[PDB]
Amino acid sequence: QWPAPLANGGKSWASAFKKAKATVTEMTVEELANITSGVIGLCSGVTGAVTRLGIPEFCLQDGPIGPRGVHGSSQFPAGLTVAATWDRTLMYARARGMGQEFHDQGVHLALAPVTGGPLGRTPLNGRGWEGTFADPYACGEASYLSVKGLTDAGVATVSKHWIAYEQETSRNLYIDIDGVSQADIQLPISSNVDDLTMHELYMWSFAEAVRAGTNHIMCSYNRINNTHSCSNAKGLNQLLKTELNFQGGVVSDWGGQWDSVPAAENGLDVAMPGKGFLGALGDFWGATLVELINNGTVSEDLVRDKAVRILTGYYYLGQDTNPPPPFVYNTIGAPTLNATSGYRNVRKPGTAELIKEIGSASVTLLKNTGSLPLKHPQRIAVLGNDATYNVLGPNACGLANSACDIDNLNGTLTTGGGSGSALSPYTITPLEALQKRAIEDNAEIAAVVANSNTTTGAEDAIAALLPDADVTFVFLNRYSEEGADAPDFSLGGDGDNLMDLAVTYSSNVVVVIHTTGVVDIEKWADNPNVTAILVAYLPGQEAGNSLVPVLYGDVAPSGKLPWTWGKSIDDYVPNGVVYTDAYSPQSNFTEGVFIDYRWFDKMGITPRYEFGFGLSYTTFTYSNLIVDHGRWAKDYSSVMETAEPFAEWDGTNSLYDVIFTVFATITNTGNLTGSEVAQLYISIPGDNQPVRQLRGFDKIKDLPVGDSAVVTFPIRRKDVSSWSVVDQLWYVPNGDFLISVGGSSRDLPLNTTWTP
């Protein structure tokens, strides 16, 4: 029994809380029920107004790359893409730019960011791309900064999806169309997760989200230990609202709520989407919640807390005294909502170049045999539909980027499909950026952008073009979307065919991959004719113009992989996606904390490219490890505080105090200016413990040839602790702590031991 704990406003929201409570205390039962459930409107979800007290409808709006379904905005790169920069500044600026467009379109609550659900159990996850690293620490850091960027713009965050939401297949959102109900077919997948794993792996990034001041959290579609996340008392009432001390609200995923009373008692604050979407995704608390309070079944006290948690965000971001503008676009779509759209342009100068910079900083060089950077080649060939436009238009796939035909030539993969996608004012195609440069060089350039397998002449055109080209670019992609997991690592479209042809007719093939996750290139990776391989992830609207400068040496590539690139899907955590028709599907997380590189490291498995890998046009030599135990500091800068119990607690100190700081020195040992992502790993001693765990990163920007720079890694008490299942608290174990530093999770030239 995990009772609903009362909100008190915590640290930064004290005055907002007090206002929220004053306002909530005035409300009738109808009004409590109005604000805690969704109504029909232009946004993804809309809270009911409390019209007597001048509380307007709040506009809740997808999604984690910025406002979805909206014109007059910019298409930012996806979370995956910022992760790959390993650049905290970029992580924040991105979220801050997303925030002004959210705010300036009229959004009260952004359904963003993705802060560790899905985190990365399976590399086939259809929506893994919406997140950031397959790693609790790095996801933590990027989640914190993404939240800060959105809240600093005046927009309230719904960080998602809590929790253990690690596969799309059989997620089974509630839907009751006709009598054809989901409860009659299959329950959602049940993530069965042990207590140590839940704390050390899945909760980690959500602790960071909380600490950054996420105003809300979204409970996920999956069950946990066979109880829906949105009505799991242990999950919401104890882990989130007691141990993490979460003062904000729990919003249901759309169809995440499966009942009225348990949801009300077990931690849910907001029923979405309520009356939207024809009430087809369940509507368990409108009029129904009024009757439940009035007849004695759910206490008014309990619903008052829900309403206070909703209204805290509103007052803390000054949305009362500085209201967002009206929201003007029908993002639901006819015939579900028949309403006209207005028009607003929210693209500010500076945004296009920030989107660019994220691209240039993210693009990750995996193989370079000598063909890059390019100098001034005269004859360029380009292969792949990914090099050009969607032939039906950049937004032809619709409001959620998922409605084009299975075989359509969608063009450059600038984002993925689903609630996490967004419209584009244009797309700067790789081919167009490459042409621009080729003109500057008085060169020629030609591209085969048809489906090579089904267009008459395409193979003959490729055979004729490639042999006289000084360089051949092949552009490959792999679309995935929310709602399904990728069946395998296979390339999308005619990727396999394009690669076969290109190696047959050219011995200087440069391969660029725009993708939602890892793909299968085993057939080509080791061919000498493939001279370079880059992965550019999901770069948003500035696809071409962020990549070409890297290709041409204007700026050296500095991105590194945010997950592990294994040679086979068999090399990962088993049963990453469970396929069953069983009424009550089960997914046992028997691996525990061992996901991504932790699996590979513990199991002695060699990846093709490891977590934290990415090449430069230069080399960096790591020297002079320092662990400085006198460089400690009190945690003063968290927006909100958790109540995570820890052994070393003395009433005055924090789990997030920095206990020591570690330094290293990098030197540019090669022939060109370059940026380097230094990483730090710690092997924390214990039973059945990861070979090593990321606990720092620091990116040196534009280090000249011969120059050196210090890299600095503040280490927090938490960074060195384990969860005691027996004592239910964090503690620093006894033993030798190996501290490693270098350029990847497997290129760790500096090691030392720390023993407390």
Ligand X SMILES: CC(=O)N[C@@H]1[C@@H](O)[C@H](O[C@@H]2O[C@H](CO[C@H]3O[C@H](CO[C@@H]4O[C@H](CO)[C@@H](O)[C@H](O)[C@@H]4O[C@H]4O[C@H](CO)[C@@H](O)[C@H](O)[C@@H]4O)[C@@H](O)[C@H](O[C@H]4O[C@H](CO)[C@@H](O)[C@H](O)[C@@H]4O)[C@@H]3O)[C@@H](O)[C@H](O[C@H]3O[C@H](CO)[C@@H](O)[C@H](O)[C@@H]3O[C@H]3O[C@H](CO)[C@@H](O)[C@H](O)[C@@H]3O)[C@@H]2O)[C@@H](CO)O[C@H]1O
Ligand Y SMILES: CC(=O)N[C@@H]1[C@@H](O)[C@H](O)[C@@H](CO)O[C@H]1O
Ligand Z SMILES: CC(=O)O[C@@]12CO[C@@H]1C[C@H](O[C@@H]1OC[C@@H](O)[C@H](O)[C@H]1O)[C@@]1(C)C(=O)[C@H](O)C3=C(C)[C@@H](OC(=O)[C@H](O)[C@@H](NC(=O)c4ccccc4)c4ccccc4)C[C@@](O)([C@@H](OC(=O)c4ccccc4)[C@H]21)C3(C)C
Centre a 10 Å sphere on the Cβ of residue 179 and count the other Cβ atoms it contains.
6
Our finding on whether 62 is near ligand Z (CB under 6 A) is: yes
User: What does 507 bind: ligand Z, a second copy, ligand Y, none (CB cut-off 5 to 8 Å by kind)?
Assistant: ligand Y
**Three-state secondary structure of 616-629:** CCCCEEEEEEEEEC
In the set 175, 396, 578, 672, which binds ligand Z (CB under 6 A)? 175
The dihedral built from the CA positions of residue 269, 273, 279 and 280, taken in this order, carries a sign that is negative
Q: 379-383 and 729-731 as β-strands: parallel, antiparallel, unpaired? A: unpaired
Residue 397 or 438: the one with the smaller Cβ distance to ligand Z is 397
Determine the Cα–Cα distance for residues 268 and 329; give it in Å rounded to an integer. Answer: 28
Residue 110 or 449: the one with the smaller Cβ distance to ligand Z is 110
User: Of the residues 253, 494, 496, 698, which is catalytic?
Assistant: 253
Whether the Cβ atoms of residue 743 and residue 620 lie closer than 8 Å to each other: yes
Residue 344 or 631: the one with the smaller Cβ distance to a second copy is 344
User: What does 335 bind: ligand Z, ligand Y, ligand X, none (CB cut-off 5 to 8 Å by kind)?
Assistant: ligand Y
Give the side-chain half-sphere CA count within 13 A for 472.
28
Residues 716 to 745: which contact ligand X by CB under 6 A?
725-729
> CA triplet 91, 92, 93: central angle to 5 degrees?
100
Residues 380 to 399: which contact a second copy by CB under 8 A?
381, 388-389, 391-396
User: What does 446 bind: ligand X, ligand Z, a second copy, none (CB cut-off 5 to 8 Å by kind)?
Assistant: a second copy
User: What does 529 bind: ligand X, ligand Y, a second copy, none (CB cut-off 5 to 8 Å by kind)?
Assistant: ligand Y
> CA triplet 744, 749, 750: central angle to 5 degrees?
110
In the set 180, 334, 406, 726, which binds ligand Z (CB under 6 A)? 180
User: Where does 363-466 have alpha helices with state H?
Assistant: 430-440, 458-465
Residue 76 or 505: the one with the smaller Cβ distance to ligand Y is 505
Q: How far is the CB of 418 from ligand Z (least distance, A)?
A: 4
Our finding on whether 375 is near a second copy (CB under 8 A) is: no
Note if the bond before 161 is cis, omega within 30 degrees.
yes
Our finding on whether 457 is near a second copy (CB under 8 A) is: yes
Residue 46 or 158: the one with the smaller Cβ distance to ligand Y is 46
Token pair of 555 as six digits? 């700026």
Q: How far is the CB of 363 from ligand Y (least distance, A)?
A: 25
In the set 33, 292, 308, 399, which binds ligand Y (CB under 6 A)? 292
Our finding on whether 195 is near ligand X (CB under 6 A) is: yes
The secondary structure element, H or E, covering residue 318 is none
Q: How far is the CB of 148 from ligand Y (least distance, A)?
A: 31
User: What does 725 bind: ligand X, a second copy, ligand Y, none (CB cut-off 5 to 8 Å by kind)?
Assistant: ligand X
Residue 202 or 713: the one with the smaller Cβ distance to ligand X is 202
**What totals of helices (H) and strands (E) does the chain contain, helices first?**
17, 27
Q: Residue 130 carries which side chain, given as an amino acid letter? A: E
Residue 196 or 396: the one with the smaller Cβ distance to ligand X is 196
Our finding on whether 440 is near ligand X (CB under 6 A) is: no
Note if the bond before 79 is cis, omega within 30 degrees.
no
By CB neighbour count within 10 A (0-12 exposed, 13-18 middle, 19+ buried), where does 421 fall?
A: buried
Residue 603 or 725: the one with the smaller Cβ distance to ligand X is 725
What is residue 123's three-state secondary structure? Answer: coil
Q: Residue 233 carries which side chain, given as an amino acid letter? A: A
Residue 261 or 658: the one with the smaller Cβ distance to ligand Y is 261
Our finding on whether 483 is near ligand Z (CB under 6 A) is: yes
Our finding on whether 638 is near a second copy (CB under 8 A) is: no
User: What does 441 bind: ligand X, a second copy, ligand Y, none (CB cut-off 5 to 8 Å by kind)?
Assistant: none
**Could you tell me how many residues make up the chain?**
756
> CA triplet 206, 208, 209: central angle to 5 degrees?
60
Q: In whole angstroms, how far apart are CA 428 and each of 95, 413, 479, 544?
A: 22, 11, 18, 5
Site string for ligand Z, 91-120 (x = CB under 6 A): --------------------x---------
Determine the Cα–Cα distance for residues 670 and 121; give it in Å rounded to an integer. Answer: 37
Our finding on whether 625 is near a second copy (CB under 8 A) is: no
The dihedral built from the CA positions of residue 457, 458, 463 and 469, taken in this order, carries a sign that is positive
Residue 205 or 642: the one with the smaller Cβ distance to ligand Z is 205
Residues touching ligand X, count (CB under 6 A): 8
Whether the Cβ atoms of residue 42 and residue 59 lie closer than 8 Å to each other: yes
Stretch that binds ligand Z, among 199-207, 250-258, 422-430, 624-632 (CB under 6 A): 250-258
Annotation says 178 is catalytic = no
Q: How far is the CB of 424 from a second copy (least distance, A)?
A: 8
Centre a 10 Å sphere on the Cβ of residue 408 and count the other Cβ atoms it contains.
16
User: What does 291 bind: ligand Z, ligand Y, ligand X, none (CB cut-off 5 to 8 Å by kind)?
Assistant: ligand Y
Q: What are phi and psi of 587, to 5 degrees?
A: -135, 100
Our finding on whether 338 is near ligand Y (CB under 6 A) is: yes
In the set 368, 402, 408, 638, which binds ligand Z (CB under 6 A)? 402
Determine the Cα–Cα distance for residues 517 and 723; give it in Å rounded to an integer. Answer: 31
Determine the Cα–Cα distance for residues 523 and 531; give it in Å rounded to an integer. Answer: 14
Q: Which residue has the tokens 């029920």?
A: 33
Stretch that binds ligand Z, among 26-34, 35-43, 247-255, 730-738 (CB under 6 A): 247-255
In the set 178, 180, 184, 295, which binds ligand Y (CB under 6 A)? 295
Our finding on whether 278 is near ligand Z (CB under 6 A) is: yes
Closest CA to 380 of 534, 510, 545: 510
- Written as one string, the DSSP assignment of 235-295 is IIIIIIIIIS---SEEEEPTT----SHHHHHHT--BB-STTSGGGTT---SSHHHHHHHHT
Our finding on whether 51 is near ligand Y (CB under 6 A) is: yes
Q: In whole angstroms, how far apart are CA 68 and each of 64, 188, 259, 426?
A: 9, 26, 29, 15
> CA triplet 547, 113, 351: central angle to 5 degrees?
40
Q: What are phi and psi of 624, to 5 degrees?
A: 70, 60
Our finding on whether 289 is near ligand Z (CB under 6 A) is: no
Residues touching a second copy, count (CB under 8 A): 48
In the set 22, 185, 287, 439, which binds a second copy (CB under 8 A)? 439
Residue 26 or 195: the one with the smaller Cβ distance to ligand X is 195
- Written as one string, the DSSP assignment of 152-168 is HTT-EEEEEEES----S
Determine the Cα–Cα distance for residues 324 and 99; give it in Å rounded to an integer. Answer: 12
In the set 194, 291, 320, 432, which binds a second copy (CB under 8 A)? 432
Determine the Cα–Cα distance for residues 557 and 559; give it in Å rounded to an integer. Answer: 6
User: What does 254 bind: a second copy, ligand Z, ligand X, none (CB cut-off 5 to 8 Å by kind)?
Assistant: ligand Z
What is residue 696's three-state secondary structure? Answer: strand
Our finding on whether 180 is near ligand X (CB under 6 A) is: no
Our finding on whether 449 is near a second copy (CB under 8 A) is: yes
* Contact footprint for ligand Z (CB under 6 A): 44, 62, 111, 160, 173, 175, 177, 180, 182, 218, 253-255, 277-278, 280, 336, 400, 402, 418-419, 482-483
Residues of this chain that interact with ligand Y (CB under 6 A) are 49, 51, 192, 288, 291-292, 295, 297, 334-335, 338, 503, 505-507, 527-529, 586, 588
Residues that bind ligand X (CB under 6 A): 194-196, 725-729
What residues line the site for a second copy (CB under 8 A)? 71-72, 341, 343, 345, 347, 352, 378-379, 381, 388-389, 391-396, 404-405, 407-409, 424-426, 431-432, 435, 438-439, 442-450, 455-458, 461, 464-465, 468
Residue positions annotated with a catalytic role: 253
